[PDB]
C-alpha cells in the first residue's frame, strides 16, 4: 500500500531523509561514510565499523570517515545501503521499504548505471514498491512557488545552475559544473599548510568545514578586500586552543567566482548562469534576471548574493530587473518541495513499480525516467 512516502534529499554534503507531509526531515546527518581508525580490544565500544550520526559525531577522530558522493558520484553502494539501513533502522525509519513509498532525489548528468543501480537497491535489496527519483531544483521550485526560475544549488562539491521554465528545465540550457566548497576548504587547509596545520583526517577536516560554514563570508570587493591587510581573527580550537583566520574567510571563496586560483578552466557560477541565460528566449531572460533562485547549503555567507549581484552587474546590461529570491531553510526547502511532490496523486504513474522493475529494469527505468 502507498503509505506515507519518504522524501529523501541526497544533498552532496548533507543527505536528508524524512516522510512526506512533514516539514522537517527528522532523520538527517551529512553525506559521509565512517569507518574506524584503531582496533578496540576492550569492550565498551560500538560494533559494526560503520558509525553514522551521533556515533560519527561522537567518535570523530576515532573513525576514519570518508565520503561516498564525490560531486554527485557515489561509490560506496553497499555502505550506501547500510546508510539507508541506518535510516531504515529503529533510529530513524523503524519501517520497511515495501511498507512506505520513497521519494529519492537526483542531479543532472548522472550515469544511468548508478541510477539504475540504486533502483536495484530499492527493488532488490530494499523493495520499495513506489519509488520515484528526480532533480532537487524542481523541489526548490515547489518551495519558492516559482515555476520559471534558474536554480543553482550550493552543496559541498556540487553546483549545477539549472534554468527551469514552468517546471521544464531546458536541457540545452541546463548547466552542471558540480564543484564547490570541498576543495575550497581543502585549499584553506593549504592555507593552514602555509600556516603549519594539517587536516588530512576527515574529522580533522570536518572542523575546517565547521569553521568554514561558521567563520567565512563573501567580501564583495575581490582584490580590494584581498589587498587590504586582514586582522587574522583568532578562532578557538575545539580542544580549547585558538587560531587566526586571515583573508581565508573571504579569500578562499573567491575561487568560486575565480576558478583559476585552483587552476581550472571554468568561469564562475555567475558567468555559467549567464551562459544558461543566453540559451533561451530573450524575453524570458528578463524574468530570469529577476528570477534568481538561490539554493543549497553553501548560500550562507555575508555579502554572498550581494557579491553575486555585483557579478550580475558586471554581466547584465542596464535596465535589467535583477531580483534575488533567497530562501532560508535551503536544503529543507527542497525537502519540503519533495513533500509537496510526493503528496500528489497523479504522481502514482511514472514511479517504477516493483513489477515494472521486474519487466525490464533498465529500459523500464529509461522510459519512465524519460
Ligand X SMILES: Nc1ncnc2c1ncn2[C@@H]1O[C@H](COP(=O)(O)OP(=O)(O)O)[C@@H](O)[C@H]1O
Question: Based on the number of CB atoms within 10 Å of its own CB, is 162 exposed (0-12), middle (13-18) or buried (19 or more)?
Answer: buried
Beta bridge partners of 248: none
Span near ligand X by CB under 6 A; candidates 37-45, 86-94, 149-157, 362-370: 149-157
Supply 70's cell numbers. 564525490
Q: Which of residues 78-107 bind ligand X (CB under 6 A)?
A: none
> Among 79, 156, 183, 311, which residue interacts with ligand X (rule: CB under 6 A)?
156
Q: Residue 58's closest CA among 68, 41, 46? A: 46
Work out whether 177 is an interface residue with ligand X (CB under 6 A).
Answer: no
- Cα angle at 77 between 74 and 78, to 5 degrees? 155
Where in 232-271 is the site for its own copies (CB under 8 A)?
262-263, 265-266
DSSP single-letter state for residue 352: B
Closest distance to ligand X from the beta carbon of 154 (Å):
5
**Out of its own copies, ligand X, another protein, none, which partner does residue 181 contact, by CB within 5 to 8 A per kind?**
ligand X
CA distances from 116 to 31, 58, 254, 292 (A): 20, 34, 37, 33
Q: Which 110-139 residues touch ligand X, going by CB under 6 A?
A: 136
The listed partner (its own copies, ligand X, another protein, none) that binds 165, CB under 5 to 8 Å by sort, is: another protein
Identify the sign of the CA torsion 346, 351, 356, 362: positive
Taking the least distance from each CB to another protein, the nearer of 141 and 218 is 141
Q: Which does 14 bind (CB under 5 to 8 A by kind): its own copies, ligand X, another protein, none?
A: ligand X
Residues found in the chain: 370
Q: Could you say which residues in the range 308-367 bind another protein, by CB under 8 A?
A: 344, 346-347, 349-350
> Least distance (Å) from another protein to the CB of residue 351?
10
Total number of residues binding its own copies (CB under 8 A)?
23
Q: Is 147 in the site for another protein (CB under 8 A)?
A: yes
Q: Does 282 bind another protein (CB under 8 A)?
A: no
C-beta separation of 192 from 299 below 8 A = no
Out of its own copies, another protein, ligand X, none, which partner does residue 145 contact, by CB within 5 to 8 A per kind?
Answer: another protein
| Cβ atoms of 152 and 295 closer than 8 Å | yes
For residue 97, give the 3-state DSSP assignment: coil
Residue 194 contact partner, candidates another protein, ligand X, its own copies, none, CB within 5 to 8 A by sort of partner = its own copies
Taking the C-alpha atoms of residue 162 and residue 175, their distance in angstroms, rounded to an integer, is 6
Give CA–CA dist 305/152, Å, rounded: 12
Contact status: 70 vs ligand X (CB under 6 A): no
**Is residue 219 near ligand X by the rule CB under 6 A?**
no
Judged by CB, which is closer to another protein: 12, or 140? 140
Task: Output 232 or 355, the one with its CB closest to its own copies.
Answer: 232
| Shortest reach from residue 31's CB to ligand X, in Å | 6
- 276-301 burial, b for 16+ CB within 10 Å, e for fewer? bbeebeeebbbbbbebbbbbbbbbeb
Number of residues located near another protein, criterion CB under 8 A: 23
CA separation for the pair 1, 98 (Å, rounded): 8
DSSP string computed for 55-79: HHHHTTTTEEEE-S-SSS----HHH
Interface ranges with another protein (CB under 8 A): 141-142, 145, 147-148, 165-168, 170-172, 260, 263, 265, 281, 284, 344, 346-347, 349-350, 370
Interface ranges with ligand X (CB under 6 A): 11-14, 136, 153-156, 158, 181, 209, 212-213, 296-298, 300-301, 331
Interface ranges with its own copies (CB under 8 A): 64, 73, 109-113, 170, 172, 176-177, 193-196, 198, 200-201, 262-263, 265-266, 279
Amino acid at each position: 500500500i502507498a503509505n506515507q512516502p519518504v522524501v529523501i534529499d541526497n544533498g552532496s554534503g548533507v543527505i536528508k531523509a524524512g516522510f512526506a507531509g512533514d516539514q522537517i526531515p527528522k532523520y538527517c546527518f551529512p553525506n559521509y561514510v565512517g569507518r574506524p581508525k584503531h582496533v578496540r580490544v576492550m569492550a565498551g565500544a560500538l560494533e559494526g565499523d560503520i558509525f553514522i550520526g551521533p556515533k560519527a559525531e561522537e567518535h570523530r577522530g576515532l573513525l576514519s570517515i570518508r565520503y561516498p558522493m564525490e560531486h554527485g558520484i557515489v561509490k560506496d553502494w553497499n555502505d550506501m545501503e547500510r546508510i539507508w539501513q541506518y535510516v531504515y533502522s529503529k533510529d530513524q525509519l523503524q519501517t520497511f521499504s515495501e511498507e512506505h513509498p520513497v521519494l529519492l532525489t537526483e542531479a543532472p548528468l548522472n550515469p544511468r548505471k548508478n541510477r539504475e543501480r540504486a533502483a536495484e537497491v530499492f527493488f532488490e535489496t530494499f523493495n520499495v514498491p513506489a519509488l520515484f527519483i528526480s532533480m532537487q531544483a524542481v523541489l526548490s521550485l515547489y518551495a519558492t512557488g516559482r515555476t520559471t526560475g534558474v536554480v543553482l544549488d550550493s552543496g559541498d562539491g556540487v553546483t549545477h545552475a539549472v534554468p527551469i521554465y514552468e517546471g521544464f528545465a531546458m536541457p540545452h540550457s541546463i548547466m552542471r559544473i558540480d564543484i564547490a566548497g570541498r576543495d575550497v576548504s581543502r585549499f584553506l587547509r593549504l592555507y593552514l599548510r602555509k600556516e603549519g596545520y594539517d587536516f588530512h583526517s576527515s574529522s580533522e577536516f570536518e572542523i575546517v568545514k565547521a569553521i568554514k560554514e561558521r567563520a567565512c563570508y563573501l567580501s564583495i570587493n575581490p582584490q580590494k578586500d584581498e589587498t587590504l591587510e586582514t586582522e587574522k581573527a583568532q578562532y578557538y580550537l575545539p580542544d580549547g586552543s585558538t587560531i587566526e583566520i586571515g583573508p581565508s574567510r573571504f579569500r578562499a571563496p573567491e575561487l568560486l567566482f575565480r576558478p583559476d586560483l585552483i587552476g581550472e578552466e571554468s568561469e564562475g557560477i555567475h558567468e555559467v548562469l549567464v551562459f544558461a541565460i543566453q540559451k533561451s528566449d530573450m524575453d524570458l531572460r528578463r524574468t530570469l534576471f529577476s528570477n534568481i533562485v538561490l539554493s543549497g547549503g553553501s548560500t550562507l555567507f555575508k555579502g554572498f548574493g550581494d557579491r553575486l549581484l555585483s557579478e550580475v552587474k558586471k554581466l547584465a546590461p542596464k535596465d535589467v530587473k535583477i531580483r534575488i529570491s533567497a530562501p532560508q531553510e535551503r536544503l529543507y526547502s527542497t525537502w519540503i518541495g519533495g513533500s509537496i511532490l510526493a503528496s500528489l496523486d497523479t504522481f502514482k504513474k511514472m514511479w517504477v513499480s516493483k513489477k515494472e522493475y521486474e519487466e525490464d529494469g533498465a529500459r523500464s527505468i529509461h522510459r519512465k525516467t524519460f
